Structures are given as C-alpha cells and as structure tokens.
Amino acid sequence: GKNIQVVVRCRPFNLAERKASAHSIVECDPVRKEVSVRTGGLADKSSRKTYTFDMVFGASTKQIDVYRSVVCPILDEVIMGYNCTIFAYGQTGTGKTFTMEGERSPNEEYTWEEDPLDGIIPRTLHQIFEKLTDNGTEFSVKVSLLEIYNEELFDLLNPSSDVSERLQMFDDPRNKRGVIIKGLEEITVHNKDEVYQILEKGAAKRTTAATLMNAYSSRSHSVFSVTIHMKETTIDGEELVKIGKLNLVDLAGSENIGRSGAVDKRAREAGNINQSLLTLGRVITALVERTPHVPYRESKLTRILQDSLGGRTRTSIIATISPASLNLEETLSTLEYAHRAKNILNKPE
Ligand SMILES: Cc1ccc(C(=O)N(CCCN)[C@@H](c2oc3cc(Cl)ccc3c(=O)c2Cc2ccccc2)C(C)C)cc1
Ligand SMILES: Nc1ncnc2c1ncn2[C@@H]1O[C@H](COP(=O)(O)OP(=O)(O)O)[C@@H](O)[C@H]1O
Ligand SMILES: [Cl-]
Ligand SMILES: [Cl-]
Ligand SMILES: [Cl-]
Ligand SMILES: [Cl-]
Ligand SMILES: [Co+2]
Helix, strand or coil, X not given: CCCEEEEEEECCCCHHHHHCCCCECEEEECCCCEEEEEXXXXXXXXXXXXXXXXXXXXXXXXXXXXXXXXXXXXXXXHHCCCEEEEEEEEXXXXXXXXXXXXXXXCCCCCCHHHCCCECHHHHHHXXXXXXXXXXXXXXXXXXXXXXXXXXXXXXXXXXCCCCCCCCEEEEECCEEEEEEEECCCCXXXXXXXXXXXXXXXXXXXXXXXXXXXXXXXXXXXXEEEEEEEXXXXXXXXXXXXXXXXXXXXXXCCXXXXXXXXXXXXXXXXXXXXXXXXXXXXXXXXXXXXXXXXXXXXXXXXXXXXXXXXXXXXXXXXXXXXXXXXXXXXXXXXXXXXXXXXXXXXXXXX
C-alpha cells in the first residue's frame, strides 16, 4: 500500500571516516530504488546485498530533494485535513537530526527559511505559513515537542517547567485511538518567525536535559507536532473547517537493534528504548500487511502516535545510513528493519 512509504537516505562520508580511511561499502541506485551494500571481506567484490525501497537518496542528495519527494506530498494531505507522520530511523550519527532539523549555513548568508541546509521541520513551518497565506485561508498553527526517554515523557517547549518534571499520559475518553498528555504545552505560533525562538528555547531546554540523563538525545525519541486549524470560504457561500496535523519523529538511535541471526542480539536489544523501536516496527508491518493485531499499547511512542498511524493517513519512514565500513553491521540492520517494515521485493537484475 502506497500510503505508507519507506525510503533510505545515505549521508556522505564524514571527516572521521575519511581519516580512518574507511571504505565506501554502500551503493544507492535512485532510478532502481535500490541500495546495495558490499557485505564481505576487504577483497570480496562478489559479496553484496541488495534492498529495494519506495525511494533511495544517495550521498549527494540535498535537503530540498528530500523535502520535495518525501514531505511535500504529505504536507498536501495535512493541509487537506489529515493527520500524518514522518519518522527518521537509523544509527546514531547517520543523520536523523540533520534530516528533521538541519543546520545553519556559515557566515550570515541566509534567512533561516531560505537556508539550503534546513531540514524537514523549518521547511514545513515555512511552507505552512507561505501556502495558507497564498490560498487566503484563515488558519492558526500550534506546536509541541515531546521527548521520550527511559519511558518518561518530557515537554521541551515549557519555559517554566524547568526542567525534568515528567508528564502523565492517559487514554482519551473521547477518542478510542487517542491519548491526552497532561500538561503538554502546545505553543501557538502567531507569526512564522516565532518558531525560531520557540525552537531555540527548545534546544536549550534539550541541552540541559543532556547534562542530566545518560546518553540523552541518542537514546531519546523526539516528537514534534504541528496542528493547523484552517478555515476557508468558497466562491458561493460556504465556510469550510479542516484540522490537519503533522508529526515529525526523530527516533532514538538504532545501533543496538540487531540484524537477524546476530550472535548476542537479545542481550544487545534489551531495554525500553530498543524495544520501543521494535514495537514501532511491528505496528508498521501490521499496518502494511493489514493484520488485525497492531500493538500500539506496547510502547509510549506508538500509544502517542496511534491516532495518526491508524486513520486515513500518510506515513513515511526515512531510514538513514552511513556509507562507511565502520558502520557495516548497523547499516545492514537498518536496511533489514526498513525492509521488514514494508516488504518490497527486489526487481530482476
Ligand atoms: C537555518 C538553521 C537551521 C538549523 C538551526 C539549528 O541549528 N537549530 C538548532 C538545532 C540543530 N539540530 C534550530 C532548530 O532547533 C530545533 C530545536 C529543537 Cl528542540 C527541535 C527542532 C529544532 C529545529 O528543527 C531547528 C531548525 C529550525 C527550525 C525553525 C526555524 C529555523 C531552524 C534553531 C531554531 C536554533 C538554525 C538555523
Ligand atoms: N546528508 C548529510 N549531509 C551532510 N552531513 C550530514 C548529513 N547527515 C548527517 N550529517 C552530519 O553528520 C553528523 C551526525 O548527524 P546527525 O543528524 O546528528 O545524526 P543522528 O541524528 O542520526 O545521530 C552531523 O555532524 C551532521 O552534520
Ligand atoms: Cl574492512
Ligand atoms: Cl504542491
Ligand atoms: Cl506483538
Ligand atoms: Cl508481545
Ligand atoms: Co551513494
């Protein structure tokens, strides 16, 4: 089913990897939607595995390419009144956060909205304001940013929370698929430029969080949500009301998720964070295969996203990998995970 998409983004070789003279073991064919990884020893050319996805982005792919292929078709649905999710999944250091958030280009050269290094979040907020303005619709934008760490929920947008008070999740009595997270702060964004300070405060609150908690931000899931209340009036009479929602999910690093058949796999995958990643896999698979049992309850992440994941929706996963020999096992495990989420057969060579 086309409503759930799985894509892979390979990042360029970094400086660490080039100074270790790491080998480049990954090949991405965009046209064939294939990613092939040399799986064997230093000299073994013959030995390679191939996987097929909805899309594949090689190392020269820029932020804009990712946004237009993956994001923009989804944003169209959100603005049409739906509730949609995009995940970034992958080993620590592979670009989950670069993809979701992005970076500032050097010197002064860009307004934040025009910076080509922008990731999904800034691009999305920019487009919501620009597009709804051009359409003449009346709208408002609200945002919240929830972090998940050791099963505890944290609001990163609460200035006065300060800091590490945990929120409380309840089933929503008025929504069978919904939860209410008690005291989660949804900030209203009156003017597009305000997101910058809101999120800059979020980052400082996030930096603080790292100073007390163990391996924070590699082990945490971050859920950014934008809700848009929109009102249009048609040519003849009608006032029209729609609520769209977009979840942008930067997942805990996948480094301890094993490939199948791995020696120590159970031991490595122990702990709440690793199991939440696996639970998510199960939910996605069950949604793709359309099996009746989809286990949303077995993690906090999937309880929070159930409402989005289970409706008339678009859901994409961006699986980020390193090109390097330093990363081989983690890259293969990421591809296996992505492949298990949505099973796409290799086309004939
Ligand atoms: C053009 C640009 C791109 C990235 C940044 C940046 O480095 N940020 C900090 C986080 C980098 N991983 C931005 C940023 O911070 C976030 C903090 C949290 Cl807690 C969650 C998401 C973001 C995020 O998406 C961004 C990127 C951004 C968002 C809105 C406007 C401009 C940039 C600024 C708002 C400081 C600043 C400017
Ligand atoms: N597509 C990319 N192009 C260039 N640099 C990238 C890319 N993806 C990640 N990086 C860089 O690699 C480092 C780690 O990326 P990050 O997004 O923090 O990974 P993760 O969030 O998956 O741990 C950062 O310095 C980031 O700037
Ligand atoms: Cl090697
Ligand atoms: Cl469009
Ligand atoms: Cl199960
Ligand atoms: Cl189970
Ligand atoms: Co490539």
